[PDB]
Structure 1
Amino acid sequence: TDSSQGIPQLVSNISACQVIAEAVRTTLGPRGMDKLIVDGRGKATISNDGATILKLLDVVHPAAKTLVDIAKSQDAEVGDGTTSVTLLAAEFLKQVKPYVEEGLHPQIIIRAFRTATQLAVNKIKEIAVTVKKADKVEQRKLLEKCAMTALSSKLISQQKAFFAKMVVDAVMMLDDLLQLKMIGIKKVQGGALEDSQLVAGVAFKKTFSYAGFEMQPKKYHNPKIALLNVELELKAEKDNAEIRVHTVEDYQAIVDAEWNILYDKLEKIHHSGAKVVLSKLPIGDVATQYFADRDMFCAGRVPEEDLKRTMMACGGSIQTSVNALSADVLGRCQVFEETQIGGERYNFFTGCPKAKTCTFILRGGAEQFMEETERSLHDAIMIVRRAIKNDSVVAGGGAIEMELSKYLRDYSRTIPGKQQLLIGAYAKALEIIPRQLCDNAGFDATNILNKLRARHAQGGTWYGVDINNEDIADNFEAFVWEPAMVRINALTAASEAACLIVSVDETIKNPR
């Protein structure tokens, strides 16, 4: 029944934002903690990504709603920088909280924040160094160094790194986007003799075998996948319907009357050229025999993702009819092979006219190695894509925030106005990345921040932080970098969010 306007409203907004800021904080580094989320249904899920946690959580607060909306928009428009922007906004709010209750009009800090953001953007633009085909002679050394940097993030085997480099270099043809959400990836299960294999085409999973399944040819010269939503199962067709039960001649009569239409339909759908039937429902017992007697192919039990991949690779068309079809909405392949490995039957559709997707089979013969060690390859291919597509780059880690903070602190000592303390607080609030990175690894950030400030007091290089050796080394030599375009956008989004939060002075409610 109590409400105010001004300082109490801003204090309440800051306190509400602090809750959602502290709710997600430990999930920032590469080895963050896991979180189990469960709803009222009864199924729980373990996740560690900040975007997945923010998407599965709703707040009944306007400021928190705007913050999570801005974070979702930034994650959808870019793809990196969701928790860092929230942490920066929380630190800015925590630094601006004591400079509000002392009788200060917040309309004078927006200009100072904008000038500081502009100066930081100008410094980043003038300090960024880009390199793209200008040295290292032929591109062979360039790709060798790229593969070395890709395998330098995680200590894995050499053959796995070579296979990852091959699968990331053999898919750069018609892809002109800035994300791997087009071709995608698929993890298979099982084991093989080698550690990893590569192929060009659509893959498949385990298929149920029946009696006489070897009647179909293993190799096809010019196969054509039959894109039909209907299936030929014992439940689809029928041999006896509503008829008068008297003797056995009526059964043969009705089964012949049905088989006439069945043969007409199958010959009409086979005369178009399609012969590789990919039925969604599993096959029965007599359907396989009927398909083998006509020297045709039969299948069953296939997921929707495999059908979509086949339609995208082979170039199939969506067919919404069973009969009265033509010979133009059908797919055309080239080589269809069936090779069994271990205790499963694998399929290979090699020879697609549209080189789009490729299968990277990773089977070592275990049950836990398939689920684990899956984020390292994703991070490696993401770094490779970011280094190939983007041109500008800079040293990653905590080597770019300390220099900007020192520059802002040195520049704030040449202004005779009220913006001195504002710029000082803005520069102090920029130190939240390396402290959190050191706290998430179980180290002592107090023993590292002092050394970083002592090294950056007169050096100004790319000396970041370490995790394994737990020391201070040069990030430019550790083969770890980051694009110089995501940080600018993240800082701009954080500044805009802070300005929108500090601009709101009160709210207005309406019952009816």
Structure 2
Amino acid sequence: GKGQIISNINACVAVQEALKPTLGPLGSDILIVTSNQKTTISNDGATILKLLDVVHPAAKTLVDISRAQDAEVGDGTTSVTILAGELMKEAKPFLEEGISSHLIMKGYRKAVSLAVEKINELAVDITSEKSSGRELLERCARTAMSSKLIHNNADFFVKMCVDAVLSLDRNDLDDKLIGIKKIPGGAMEESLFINGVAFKKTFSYAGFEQQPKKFNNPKILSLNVELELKAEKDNAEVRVEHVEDYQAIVDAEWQLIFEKLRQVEETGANIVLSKLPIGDLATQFFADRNIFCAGRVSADDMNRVIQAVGGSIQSTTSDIKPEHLGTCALFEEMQIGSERYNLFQGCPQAKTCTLLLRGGAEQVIAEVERSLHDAIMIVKRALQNKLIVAGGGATEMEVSKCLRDYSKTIAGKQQMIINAFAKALEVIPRQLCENAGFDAIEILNKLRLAHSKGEKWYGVVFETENIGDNFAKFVWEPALVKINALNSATEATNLILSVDETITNKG
């Protein structure tokens, strides 16, 4: 009956209400505690909805549509759910008046079909007009970094951000290919960019003051087995009554270990990486030959080394092939952050990079890293997609403006339905002003003044509260986000309003 539909309305608002403070770069962050006893705090709607695991079927649809938004595009997972659930509240008073839910869903598909046509009209392709090659990506990075603690140091941060994108092929770009390692302590303006890959350097074992950190072209070799004398678990049980045999079995167990240990020297690789801890036995023999070895390396960093110098992982030290080795241009071990950090530099075949960040605390750098991810997506999609639209309230207010005039020519229930859909588009600029501390009552009325003067580009300024054009604010958004957001929000809403009854079986 109608009771199940009303119950699904509050379920969509409850999920939407949690994502309202997370809308926008200045928006608040949500606290989610997983059953794994790990604290996770993020403003990205994808990770938010994936960690909740809501049992409600209609609320799960808002979670499933966010994964589809993260797949095709990946940006706007928070706004697509807010826009989808907003139609649940607008259609709530229409259900009590006797209006069928199918007539309401039918009016949305006619409004979205007309809205997509207006997106292409507002999208203007511009590349070399009034813009250069270097200044194109630099002006886009300063927009996402504004109104942040890094705004003073943003001058040095843009140079490292643009070079990170240009270091990869412009045909295929991925945010996971750019590594970021947090270094506690130090000045923020002293951070540098690294062409290779770095790791945490968890090696706790003695034997220091050897294996110098100045290399020319060291060879990289992957290690699998354990080269230390005493094993982790098993051992060798030998029962002998001779005194001389007690010393022989000590070297006998070491002879089997020295077998694969000596074969590493036959390869002639100065760099040895392994996912297992390397004891003091291997690093002592490698000290005289100036061979470096590091254990306890994460598996995620080992995959980047293969894509860097073109290496490979072999089980034993016998069949290792000579072409599996690799080398960088320069290897330097930096002590920045009261800890030594290994890094690679000058790899022409490297498909990944690493950007080091410095700050006063780990919690401060964590906000700098996440604020950079929003700027990378803008720089990445600039070269990929040449069709961009004006964001920050610009496009959102115009899509609702045109639907008001087109509804005057349409007769029937669909007139007020499109007007309700046009009113439902006002929640996006609302939460942006509320999460930024600005008054949502005054800006909503003042923005509609110049918005009716014929200019469609008037946006909302995120720095100082005022109405104006985002074209001077350098706020750019790709056209694929605005098109897929209206389709994903409507498709997810049509599935929720189409459920008359919820059946749940226990077992």
Please tell me the TM-score bracket, short chain as reference: 0.7 to 0.9
Mapping for residues 166-315 of structure 1, pairs under 5 Å: 166-172=160-166, 173-191=168-186, 195-206=190-201, 213-216=208-211, 218-236=213-231, 241-244=236-239, 246=241, 248-294=243-289, 296-315=291-310
Please say which of residues 480-489 and 247-256 is displaced more in the overlay: 247-256
Q: 2 CA distance for matches of 1:340 and 1:275?
A: 20
Q: CA deviation at 1:95?
A: 1.8
Query: In the alignment, is the contact (CA less than 8 A) between 1:338 and 1:346 conserved in 2?
Result: yes
Mapping for residues 93-492 of structure 1, pairs under 5 Å: 93-136=88-131, 139-142=133-136, 145-146=139-140, 149=143, 154=148, 156=150, 160-172=154-166, 173-191=168-186, 195-206=190-201, 213-216=208-211, 218-236=213-231, 241-244=236-239, 246=241, 248-294=243-289, 296-341=291-336, 343-363=338-358, 369-492=364-487
Q: CA deviation at 1:111?
A: 3.4
Q: 2 CA distance for matches of 1:182 and 1:464?
A: 33
SS of the aligned residue for 2:469 comes to coil
1:259-310 Cα offsets, whole Å, 9 max, x none, are 4444443333432343432344444444433333455433334333332322
User: 1:122 corresponds to which letter in structure 2?
Assistant: E
Structure 2 unpaired stretches of 5+:
none
SS of the aligned residue for 1:56 comes to helix
Specify the alignment match of 1:19 in structure 2: 14
Q: CA deviation at 1:336?
A: 3.2
1:493–1:74 Cα change, 3 Å: same
Structure 1 unpaired stretches of 5+:
none
User: 1:16 corresponds to which letter in structure 2?
Assistant: A
Candidates 51, 54, 57, aligned match of 2:52: 57
Query: In the alignment, is the contact (CA less than 8 A) between 1:339 and 1:347 conserved in 2?
Result: yes
TM-score, with structure 2 as normaliser: 0.87
Q: 1 CA distance for matches of 2:410 and 2:239?
A: 103
- Greater gyration radius: 1
Specify the alignment match of 2:72 in structure 1: 77
Query: In the alignment, is the contact (CA less than 8 A) between 2:227 and 2:282 conserved in 1?
Result: yes
Q: How many residues align?
A: 505
Q: 1 CA distance for matches of 2:173 and 2:319?
A: 42
1:335–1:487 Cα change, 3 Å: same
Please say which of residues 480-489 and 254-263 is displaced more in the overlay: 254-263
Query: In the alignment, is the contact (CA less than 8 A) between 1:220 and 1:334 conserved in 2?
Result: no
SS of the aligned residue for 1:298 comes to strand
Q: 2 CA distance for matches of 1:339 and 1:416?
A: 72
Please say which of residues 38-47 and 429-438 is displaced more in the overlay: 38-47
Q: 2 CA distance for matches of 1:215 and 1:340?
A: 16
Query: In the alignment, is the contact (CA less than 8 A) between 2:308 and 2:347 conserved in 1?
Result: yes
Query: In the alignment, is the contact (CA less than 8 A) between 1:229 and 1:280 conserved in 2?
Result: yes
Q: 1 CA distance for matches of 2:333 and 2:78?
A: 47
Q: CA deviation at 1:489?
A: 0.6
SS of the aligned residue for 2:182 comes to coil
1:126-161 Cα offsets, whole Å, 9 max, x none, are 22212123444x535545645655665657467653
Q: 2 CA distance for matches of 1:189 and 1:508?
A: 52
Please say which of residues 470-479 and 30-39 is displaced more in the overlay: 30-39
Query: In the alignment, is the contact (CA less than 8 A) between 1:279 and 1:301 conserved in 2?
Result: yes
CA RMSD of aligned residues (A): 3.3
User: 2:466 corresponds to which letter in structure 1?
Assistant: D
TM-score, with structure 1 as normaliser: 0.86
Q: CA deviation at 1:214?
A: 4.2
Q: CA deviation at 1:80?
A: 1.6
Greater fraction helix: 2
Candidates 477, 489, 505, aligned match of 1:494: 489
1:490-512 Cα offsets, whole Å, 9 max, x none, are 00111122222233333556689
Specify the alignment match of 2:26 in structure 1: 31
Q: CA deviation at 1:229?
A: 1.0
1:68–1:205 Cα change, 3 Å: closer
User: 2:125 corresponds to which letter in structure 1?
Assistant: T
Q: 2 CA distance for matches of 1:180 and 1:41?
A: 26
SS of the aligned residue for 2:178 comes to coil
User: 1:120 corresponds to which letter in structure 2?
Assistant: A
SS of the aligned residue for 2:223 comes to coil
Q: 1 CA distance for matches of 2:298 and 2:348?
A: 23
User: 1:62 corresponds to which letter in structure 2?
Assistant: P
SS of the aligned residue for 1:185 comes to strand
User: 2:369 corresponds to which letter in structure 1?
Assistant: E
Q: 1 CA distance for matches of 2:3 and 2:38?
A: 40
Query: In the alignment, is the contact (CA less than 8 A) between 1:233 and 1:281 conserved in 2?
Result: no
User: 1:196 corresponds to which letter in structure 2?
Assistant: S
